[PDB]
Amino acid sequence: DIVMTQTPASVSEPVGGTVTIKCQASESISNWLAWYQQKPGQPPKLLIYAAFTLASGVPSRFKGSGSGTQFTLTINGVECADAATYYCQQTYSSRDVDNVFGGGTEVVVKG
Amino acid sequence: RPTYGVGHQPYRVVVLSFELLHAPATVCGPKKSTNLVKNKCVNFNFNGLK
């Protein structure tokens, strides 16, 4: 019933820039939202839950913004250590849903 | 804080807004419908118009 898409497919920007990711919904999901990061050969880890609250032990560089339909994940500064795939989870209604998580967005940092 | 009273408890509130006009009706009450009769003194009800 709920379907999402994650854009961009991939990003690339030097060490001093800011990388941003859009997670948009077919219909509004309110604040209910979560952002996940997996290193290669590593299970994903929660970074932003409720679309605003920082997780535990995560540095204060990842910003979640937006509410309802459009959500943005913005990183103030990269250090070539956040080069991984990020996903957004609906965590709102999963009665008949093909995938709670969205598309994959791999971050590439050229240092 | 569930220990405190209902004033510190979650309340789910659903708000409904109508327009309440009897002509372009698309959301009506659950009452049934009956065949009309002509040329007789009757008390009718057309889309809420009694």
Partner: protein, 49 residues
């Protein structure tokens, strides 16, 4: 509450006799219409938040 949803209700029959079990301990205090005779009414547009 800040990001309240909005729903459109149309092209359907609306019944209130079912609105007891789904939301127990409900309070339907409201304005602009008598709730006692909501059964015999028709609505052009209904929005649920």
């Amino acid at each position: 509450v800040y990001a309240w949803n909005r729903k459109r209700i149309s092209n359907c029959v609306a019944d209130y006799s079912v609105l007891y079990n789904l939301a127990p301990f409900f309070t339907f205090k409201c304005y602009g219409v008598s709730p006692t005779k909501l059964n015999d009414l028709c609505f052009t547009n209904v929005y649920a938040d």
